[PDB]
Design an enzyme around this catalytic site. Structure first.
Site, short mmCIF file in Angstrom:
data_model
loop_
_atom_site.label_atom_id
_atom_site.label_comp_id
_atom_site.label_asym_id
_atom_site.label_seq_id
_atom_site.Cartn_x
_atom_site.Cartn_y
_atom_site.Cartn_z
N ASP A 13 0.41 -0.94 -0.08
CA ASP A 13 0.32 0.22 -0.32
C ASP A 13 1.29 1.34 0.13
OD1 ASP A 13 -0.71 -0.59 3.16
OD2 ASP A 13 1.14 0.24 2.98
N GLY A 22 -12.08 1.45 -2.18
CA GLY A 22 -11.41 0.31 -2.48
C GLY A 22 -10.71 0.49 -0.99
N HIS A 61 -7.73 3.83 18.65
CA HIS A 61 -6.82 4.74 17.59
C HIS A 61 -7.35 4.76 16.18
CE1 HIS A 61 -3.86 8.10 17.58
NE2 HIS A 61 -3.54 7.54 16.25
N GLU A 62 -6.13 3.53 15.50
CA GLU A 62 -6.70 2.88 14.41
C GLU A 62 -7.81 3.12 13.69
OE1 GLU A 62 -4.36 3.09 12.59
OE2 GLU A 62 -2.11 2.98 14.24
N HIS A 74 -8.99 6.98 13.42
CA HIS A 74 -8.87 7.42 11.63
C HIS A 74 -9.41 6.35 10.89
CE1 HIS A 74 -4.54 8.99 13.05
NE2 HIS A 74 -4.20 7.99 13.36
N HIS A 111 -4.86 13.46 14.08
CA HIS A 111 -4.27 13.67 15.26
C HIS A 111 -4.29 14.49 16.44
CE1 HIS A 111 -1.21 10.54 13.72
NE2 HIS A 111 -2.21 9.95 14.86
O1 LIG Z 1 -0.63 7.04 14.47
C1 LIG Z 1 -0.29 6.90 13.94
O2 LIG Z 1 -1.93 5.98 13.42
C2 LIG Z 1 0.48 5.43 14.15
C3 LIG Z 1 0.22 4.46 14.94
O3 LIG Z 1 1.69 4.69 15.20
C4 LIG Z 1 -0.16 5.36 16.25
C5 LIG Z 1 0.08 3.85 17.07
C6 LIG Z 1 -1.40 4.71 19.20
C7 LIG Z 1 -1.48 3.89 19.29
C8 LIG Z 1 -2.33 3.86 20.82
C9 LIG Z 1 -2.06 5.61 20.64
C10 LIG Z 1 -2.90 5.72 22.28
C11 LIG Z 1 -3.41 4.40 23.19
C12 LIG Z 1 -3.24 5.14 24.36
C13 LIG Z 1 -4.30 5.80 24.98
C14 LIG Z 1 -4.24 7.49 23.74
C15 LIG Z 1 -3.75 6.79 22.81
C16 LIG Z 1 -1.32 6.38 20.18
C17 LIG Z 1 -1.14 6.10 19.25
ZN LIG Z 2 -0.79 -0.88 5.46
ZN LIG Z 3 -2.55 7.87 14.01
#
Ligand SMILES: O=C(O)C[C@@H](O)CCc1ccc(-c2ccccc2)cc1
Ligand SMILES: [Zn+2]
Ligand SMILES: [Zn+2]
Ligand SMILES: [Ca+2]
Length: 163
Positions: A66, A86, A114-115, A118, A124
């Protein structure tokens, strides 16, 4: 305004599984992550096992097709794509991380919340208490709660739950 899902019932499918946790725990972590978001919006999420899903959940390492190869253990833990056509909506989890039900290594549940954020159209947050904050940091998963900034962000896109 950014793109958003145009329907309230969304399906997801788990394409493959990390060997780091059994199937049940992976299913559960993911289900509970969607539930965090459906609790504060009109969105309903459901897991499907065949057919094309709206949101595909994939575990993959390094280059996986990707144009956003993963980087081995550490660094970026996962990434996702906003509502779109897609690939739109999918959530990829770097299989080189070590995924855990709790704080053993990388909590899958918190990462998924978190994901999915998105996948739903959120970006963010500069609020250190927000789940959408760019930095992973473990928090007791039984105590976990979206921050006010998270809720205002997701409701701005989808509204609050119905009467
Ligand atoms: O930025 C992205 O989407 C890519 C990834 O690398 C980011 C991973 C991530 C995972 C958990 C958190 C989080 C976990 C617990 C509480 C708050 C935030 C923040 C960030
Ligand atoms: Zn990927
Ligand atoms: Zn993120
Ligand atoms: Ca990584």
């Amino acid at each position: 305004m950014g793109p958003v899902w145009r329907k309230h019932y969304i399906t997801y499918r788990i394409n493959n599984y990390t060997p780091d946790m059994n199937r049940e725990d992976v299913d559960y972590a993911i289900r509970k992550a969607f539930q965090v978001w459906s609790n504060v919006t009109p969105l309903k999420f459901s897991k499907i096992n065949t057919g094309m899903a709206d949101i595909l959940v994939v575990f993959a390492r390094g280059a996986h097709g990707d144009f956003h190869a993963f980087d081995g253990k550490g660094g970026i833990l996962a990434h996702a794509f906003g509502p779109g056509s897609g690939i739109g909506g999918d959530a990829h989890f770097d299989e080189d991380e070590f995924w855990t039900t709790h704080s053993g290594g990388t909590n899958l549940f918190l990462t998924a919340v978190h994901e999915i954020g998105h996948s739903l159209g959120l970006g963010h947050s500069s609020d250190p208490k927000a789940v959408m904050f760019p930095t992973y940091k473990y928090v007791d998963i039984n105590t976990f709660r979206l921050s006010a900034d998270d809720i205002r962000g997701i409701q701005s896109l989808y509204g609050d739950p119905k009467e």
